[PDB]
């Protein structure tokens, strides 16, 4: 949730650092989907502030 949550050494670098606090959740009974939890894009927050 902070500026620089997703970092990449260079533009073309395939390896990257990610800290989004991704947490998987329990899916709904009878529904096929991938539930998840993540922090809002810190890039957008910084762009706003």
């Amino acid at each position: 949730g902070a500026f620089g949550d997703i970092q990449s050494r260079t533009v073309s670098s395939s390896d990257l650092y990610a800290n989004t606090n991704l947490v998987l959740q329990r899916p709904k009974a009878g529904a096929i989907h991938v539930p998840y939890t993540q922090a809002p894009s810190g890039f957008e927050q910084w762009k706003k502030d």
Binding site: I6, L22, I32, V34
Partner: protein
Amino acid sequence: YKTGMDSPAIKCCGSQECTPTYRPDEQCKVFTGVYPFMWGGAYCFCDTENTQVSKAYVMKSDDCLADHAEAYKAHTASVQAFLNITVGEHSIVTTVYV
């Protein structure tokens, strides 16, 4: 960024085993007691002993190539000046450092 989400690994009337995955901020978890449904009807007959594995990862957005911020560190700055110097009716355009 975009949250890359893999397709659910649903094992009907059985159990899956999780394996290491080498992705940035890669998370994977096993869920039991699921009876998935599809447009064509109930996916799995069994009500118990069912396994649904969910896997997700974080990947760069496809727009990042054009819209991105670049973090730099700067030090030891130098100044370059453009002086118009006329010495005895000799007008020149001088590009010279300070």
